[PDB]
Symmetry: D2
Subunit: 119 residues, 4 copies
Amino acid sequence: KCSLTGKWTNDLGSNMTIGAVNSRGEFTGTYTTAVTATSNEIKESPLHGTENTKRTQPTFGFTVNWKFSESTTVFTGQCFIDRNGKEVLKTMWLLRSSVNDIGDDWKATRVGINIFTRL
Amino acid sequence: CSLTGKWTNDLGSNMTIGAVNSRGEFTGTYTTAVTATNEIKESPLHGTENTINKRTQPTFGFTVNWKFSESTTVFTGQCFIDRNGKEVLKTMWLLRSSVNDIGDDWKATRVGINIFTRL
Amino acid sequence: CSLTGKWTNDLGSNMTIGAVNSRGEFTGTYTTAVTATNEIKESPLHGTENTINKRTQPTFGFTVNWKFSESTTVFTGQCFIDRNGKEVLKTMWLLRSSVNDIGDDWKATRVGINIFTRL
Amino acid sequence: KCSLTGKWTNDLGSNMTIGAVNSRGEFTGTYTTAVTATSNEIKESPLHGTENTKRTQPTFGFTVNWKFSESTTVFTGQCFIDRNGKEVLKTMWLLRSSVNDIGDDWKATRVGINIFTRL
């Protein structure tokens, strides 16, 4: 029992809202980040993702298409039943900044973790 | 530069992305040539291209849901136009493996790079 | 804040760094509590703290050479001073596995996070 | 036969010079980067690392303590005999930028690849 639908808050402070997961595992939702590496308005954004499909703790993966910037973030993790019986999503992401030349690409990728809980 | 078409990366793996809808969203299929070794196979991958500020070289992020075995991959990158007037997808990914328990999570994620071109 | 002392991270693993020489360099031992599963064990790790601009919270980078099995790890992070006036090592790492051939390289690196404190 | 000593050039354009590797696998050298994510003088710097120790293609790991900035980079990879009989070092690195608060840590880590050859 680890539905992906719902509202979740992360260690960095953000909030993530996911909808009803279908049969092929997909889903959609909004993701208000609580942190920014830019100078723009922290404006909400939609995230698209899929979750494997029969174990209780399935690994998923989604893309959050930010609205206030030319960037994308990709999280990938697994739904765990944190010992007592509370769900906990541990994930990792790659923050893709945008450049102008096919040269300054390396300085474009950032990596970090993120633990989500049911806010 | 658009993620519509048949793409092959540097590992020998192909991938086709059908039409990138109004909003951003897009679908396709992925045929890898490697693995952590069951059988190779296609799987469905869905993504999203970042429109905002109507570029020609935007960042994108798609999730490949490996059917065989409980994996996922996520690719994050930018649609380029390398100086040969051709196209080039420069991206890094994260391969999440399904792990037995919450406390064996530290070892589930793998990081690497891939570069898709056209065929 | 200095990398001198006995440190334990969030995985149950300890680590001790002897004296950080004039230049930067420093040595120590690492005792993990996990693995990709031979036996657990200590191994020697050497690092380097970045002096330039004489800070108190500088970045560092040390390489743990896993003797048992042909691995490596590398940790990159910053010596912090979290608001409890205590210390905190916030770092991410890369675990490289020895692979049979050049063309099976894409799957050798793993990415994750660790946070060492004091004892 | 894959000695680590010597001068190597990387895909990004940089040059790396490594010295004599000892018995415990360690080594030292300079590393002139050919790219910078800052506004400083691209000034040379020393890198410290170790290499496992009996296979022909051993995996290593080193830290490059940059001189023109409060930062550290950590590479980790493996020495491969590129088919014909030329050595080739494939590696990955984590570029650790420095922050001021134990909060803005996530925006601090960058990841990317790097292939070295005997310039």
